[PDB]
Amino acid sequence: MLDYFFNPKGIAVIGASNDPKKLGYEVFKNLKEYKKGKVYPVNIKEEEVQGVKAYKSVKDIPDEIDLAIIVVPKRFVKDTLIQCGEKGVKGVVIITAGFGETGEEGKREEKELVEIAHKYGMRIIGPNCVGIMNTHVDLNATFITVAKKGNVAFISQSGALGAGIVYKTIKEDIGFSKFISVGNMADVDFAELMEYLADTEEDKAIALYIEGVRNGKKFMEVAKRVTKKKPIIALKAGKKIYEAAFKQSGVLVANTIDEMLSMARAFSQPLPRGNKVAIMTNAGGPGVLTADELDKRGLKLATLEEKTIEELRSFLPPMAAVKNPVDMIASARGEDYYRTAKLLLQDPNVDMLIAICVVPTFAGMTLTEHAEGIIRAVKEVNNEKPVLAMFMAGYVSEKAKELLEKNGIPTYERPEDVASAAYALVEQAKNVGI
Amino acid sequence: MLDYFFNPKGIAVIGASNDPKKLGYEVFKNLKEYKKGKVYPVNIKEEEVQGVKAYKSVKDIPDEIDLAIIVVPKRFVKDTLIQCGEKGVKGVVIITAGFGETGEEGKREEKELVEIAHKYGMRIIGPNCVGIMNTHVDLNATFITVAKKGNVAFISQSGALGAGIVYKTIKEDIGFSKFISVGNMADVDFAELMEYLADTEEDKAIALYIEGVRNGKKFMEVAKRVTKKKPIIALKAGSWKIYEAAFKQSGVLVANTIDEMLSMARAFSQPLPRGNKVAIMTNAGGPGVLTADELDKRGLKLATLEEKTIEELRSFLPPMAAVKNPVDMIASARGEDYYRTAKLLLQDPNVDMLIAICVVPTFAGMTLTEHAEGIIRAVKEVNNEKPVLAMFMAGYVSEKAKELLEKNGIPTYERPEDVASAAYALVEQAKNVGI
């Protein structure tokens, strides 16, 4: 329905300037990288933006524009919008503020903007927003730094928090498939966006930061139906009607930014059947905290097969715990992670595997050895069981994490985080049936 | 007492090795950075270790030894301990495992080790420990990288968690004054450590990762006293119910996650608040509401500002700016705006604590550190002793601002829940000392 926003043919950036102080600049700079479609800048008093000829108006571009990014002064917004409708623009992202967020006067002008859009069948994003992203095709209709590639579709009403989180995720080596700053959310709301995402491929899940929805009703209707295809994690600021309601619709509820992100990242793995989890770790402490976290999430530990318990016993250190949680001694090597993962992934009583590793820097072991063990094991068994990882830590575990993430395994650095993902995985699963 | 552990004049590393695959190798390697005292490598078949003259036995060392690290194979730990005894060593860190964690037989050997120590007047940390650190004097008697410098003393009953947290803090740019892996904790325990740490000056707070104490009675009474001088934050893994209540009565603050433990502990770089009324200043609404929520469920309350202060805020801030309980300067907030607002909030008689929240802007030609500078400049001016906490976002974009704030004693967080935990720890400790 809105594929012209994320997969636009020809896009127009109304207000592109070569001034380092005006948003018009950056926004165009970032679209200087979208090759999947043609982009044209628009500036009233400049026939060259930043290495490319500029058009006086949106109605002069010799080619066709289905996407318009309005990023000029507020007073020119109304007219600008009218120009787009006339050129046959399909979707418009208004970056400019000074409307509904300022009061009734602003809201009225705002309402007038929508009414104009509707006449041309156009749809508006914003206004007073940061824009939209689509990492899949290098599409970054925003004035901030692009987020890394990813399979999570993030939507939030808070532009400031929206950038802070992109900044967060980047450094945390985790991205988004598409980014959406709705701003005042005058037209295209959560609902319509939710339905569009559902049938998309690159959007494995939907993370939302909500301050207040418009159609408290229509929203759930759309959520209850979308959860059947792909999960929705929502973070609600301000302070149960939303909560319980969210629950019944099948949307996962997050209480912190990290919960929203953790839970949403986990859908890079296949869905689980039961909540019987198997913990493998080279460190007791980390295992204890995790199990404890999983136990706060309502999950449980799988009871291994005697044959399983006896196998681990033969190659692991005598003091190693090979029962409920499998504690490999700190001496566990790549081979040890590989076998243990393989053996636990094969145990019919195990639904989910959580691989915990404090990356050792002694005894000749490499920084990626343990991750590699896991990855190889996942490849060999080659079934469809969710594998989640938690490598500590800091710079020491980054290479391990980067390797794991690259091989589709969501790896976390906090006990509470991997647990949240696990929780989110079991919950979603039973929203689909199994 | 217990000082020769963190400020030794002569260290003997028994088991120092040239083989990179052995723990003794990393321990001596790490101690090469320790110059506030001499470090001697003791190895049975080595003339030199890592370029340093080595001794066959700790007895042959001409100089005085007050600290030894035993990192040899299990079957030699006994005799090595006795040698340290004859040599006159004060404290011993036994890195080696194979004792009371392996069973009843290991326990008995363990007890004998302690018995030997008491005979020679020695104290033993461990065995089965990762070691100890004193970052203040570049002392890293461990087989892992040294944590960054800091004023939080961290005691962990889990060595693996200890290492993982050290790596965590390093990247997050937070450090520890001292680090103590107690491993089996046969001799020196939490209580004795808390007694010693109660009087140092570098340790502003004590963070604890507890699996369980031996003398719960001694622990609580020691904690009760120490918690009057400086705070103790415990993360208890797992009995568990009664433990939390016991911590509470002794003035011990409880953390339920690693991040909370760390966030709460390193907040004592600031003064204790005279009340629980906090002022929130921010350049982003979202981060502010989340932070307000987090503080609320934590029991903290938002202060009510004076009209005079509200009026001046309204004079230089944008039109759609919030100047009530939470002060929301707009996204256009510049360093100057942060400076003025912080000064004004810190001067309001109803503000007991100030939380500065800043999403770092990369537009309007502002710098990556001006807002922080503005915070810093204000605190330095009013010069009262109201605690100031910062929450900056984020990722790479906020790194320089954080480094600069931390460099001025302002704890800086990246999470609404983290700054709230810190805010909570400051008020609770004020309670304890009675304020």
In B, minimum Cα distance to A183 occurs at: B286
Task: Name the residue with tokens 């230089």.
Answer: B316
Q: Are residues A73 and A145 in the same domain?
A: no
Question: Domain boundary at A218, A235, A268, which?
Answer: A268
Q: Are residues B149 and B263 in the same domain?
A: yes
Q: Are residues A80 and A134 in the same domain?
A: no
* Cβ <8 Å between B290 and A257: yes
Tell me whether the omega of the peptide bond preceding residue B394 falls within 30 degrees of 0, making it cis.
yes
Residue A336: give the domain boundaries: 269-434
Distance CA A326, CA A373 (A): 15
- Give CA separation, B6 vs B37, B91, B103, B127, B179, in Å: 11, 10, 31, 17, 9
Of B173, B235, B241, nearest to B407 by C-alpha is B173
**How far apart are the CA of B119 and the nearest CA of chain A, in angstroms?**
31
Length of chain B: 435
Distance CA B206, CA B223 (A): 11
**Which structure tokens are listed for A214?**
């418009």
Q: What CATH number is given to the structural domain containing B67?
A: 3.40.50.720
φ, ψ at A419 (rounded to 5°): -60, -45
Task: Name the residue with tokens 């600069």.
Answer: B404
Cβ-contact A149, A179 below 8 angstroms: no
- B 26-85 residues with CB < 8 A to A: 26
DSSP conformational letter for B145:
P
According to the entry, how was the structure determined? X-ray
Q: Are residues B133 and B110 in the same domain?
A: no
Question: Domain boundary at B80, B100, B128, which?
Answer: B128
- B 378-397 residues with CB < 8 A to A: 393-397
**In three state form, how does the secondary structure of chain A look?**
CCHHHHCCCEEEEECCCCCCCCHHHHHHHHHCCCCCCEEEEECCCCCECCCCECECCCCCCCCCCCEEEECCCHHHHHHHHHHHHHHCCCEEEECCCCCHHHCHHHHHHHHHHHHHHHHCCCEEECCCCCEEEEHHHCEEEECCCCCCCCCEEEEECCHHHHHHHHHHHHHCCCCCCEEEECCCCCCCCHHHHHHHHHHCCCCCEEEEEECCCCCHHHHHHHHHHHCCCCCEEEEECCCCHHHHHHHHHCEEEECCHHHHHHHHHHHHCCCCCCCEEEEEECCHHHHHHHHHHHCCCCCEECCCCHHHHHHHHHHCCCCCEECCCEECCCCCCHHHHHHHHHHHHHCCCCCEEEEEEECCCCCCCCCCHHHHHHHHHHHHHCCCCCEEEEEECHHHHHHHHHHHHHCCCCEECCHHHHHHHHHHHHHHHHHHCC
Question: Is B104 in CB contact (< 8 Å) with chain A?
Answer: no
Query: How many other CB atoms sit within 10 Å of the CB of residue A16?
Result: 31
Distance CA B53, CA B70 (A): 18
* Cβ <8 Å between A364 and B20: yes
User: What residue type is A193 in one-letter code?
Assistant: L
DSSP conformational letter for B74:
G
Q: Which residues from chain A sit within 8 angstroms of residue B159, using beta carbons?
A: 285, 330
* Cβ <8 Å between B363 and A319: no
Distance CA A94, CA A32 (A): 19
Q: Are residues B251 and B152 in the same domain?
A: yes
Q: Which residues from chain B sit within 8 angstroms of residue A23, using beta carbons?
A: 363
* Cβ <8 Å between A414 and B257: yes
**How far apart are the CA of A43 and the nearest CA of chain B, in angstroms?**
19
- The C-alpha angle B93, B98, B99, rounded to 5 degrees, equals 70
Distance CA A143, CA A36 (A): 19
Q: After which residues is chain A broken (C to N over 2.5 A)?
A: 239
* Cβ <8 Å between B287 and A163: no
Q: Are residues A97 and A80 in the same domain?
A: yes
**How far apart are the CA of A355 and the nearest CA of chain B, in angstroms?**
15
Q: Which of A170, A257, A261 to mutate to test the interface with B (most CBs of B within 10 A)?
A: A257
Of A88, A213, A82, nearest to A155 by C-alpha is A213
Q: What is the DSSP string of B20-66?
A: TTSHHHHHHHHHTT--SSEEEEE-TT-SEETTEE-BSSTTS-SS--S
Q: Which of A210, A392, A399, A420 to mutate to test the interface with B (most CBs of B within 10 A)?
A: A392
Q: Which of B158, B243, B295 to mutate to test the interface with A (most CBs of A within 10 A)?
A: B158
Of A154, A49, A162, nearest to A95 by C-alpha is A162
Question: Is B260 in CB contact (< 8 Å) with chain A?
Answer: no
φ, ψ at A11 (rounded to 5°): -120, 145
Distance CA A283, CA A306 (A): 23
Q: Are residues B314 and B420 in the same domain?
A: yes
Question: Is A366 in CB contact (< 8 Å) with chain B?
Answer: no
Q: Are residues B299 and B340 in the same domain?
A: yes
- B 402-421 residues with CB < 8 A to A: 414-417
Question: Domain boundary at B95, B128, B161, which?
Answer: B128
Distance CA A313, CA A21 (A): 65
| Beta-carbon contacts of residue A38 (< 8 Å; ≥ 6 apart) | A9, A10, A11, A63
Instruction: Tally C-beta pairs within 8 A across A and B.
Output: 159
Q: What CATH number is given to the structural domain containing A419?
A: 3.40.50.261
Q: Are residues A108 and A144 in the same domain?
A: no
- Give CA separation, A12 vs A19, A76, A128, A159, B197, in Å: 18, 16, 18, 22, 65
Question: What b/e string do you get for A95-126 counting C-beta neighbours within 10 Å, with b at 16 or more?
Answer: bbbbbbebeeebeebbeebbebbeebebbbbb
Kindly give the pairing relationship between strand B277-282 and strand B353-359: parallel
Question: Is A144 in CB contact (< 8 Å) with chain B?
Answer: yes
Distance CA A297, CA A299 (A): 6
Q: Are residues A50 and A139 in the same domain?
A: no
* Cβ <8 Å between A256 and B417: yes
Distance CA A152, CA A136 (A): 11
**Which structure tokens are listed for A52?**
């490319």
Q: Which of B254, B359, B366, B421 to mutate to test the interface with A (most CBs of A within 10 A)?
A: B359
- Give CA separation, B78 vs B17, B18, B74, B81, in Å: 19, 23, 8, 5
Distance CA A19, CA B251 (A): 57
Q: Are residues A376 and A289 in the same domain?
A: yes
Q: Which residues from chain A sit within 8 angstroms of residue B290, using beta carbons?
A: 161, 237, 256-257
**In three state form, how does the secondary structure of A125-153 look?**
ECCCCCEEEEHHHCEEEECCCCCCCCCEE
Q: Are residues A9 and A115 in the same domain?
A: yes
If one counts the domains in chain B, the total is 3
**Annotated resolution, angstroms:** 2.2
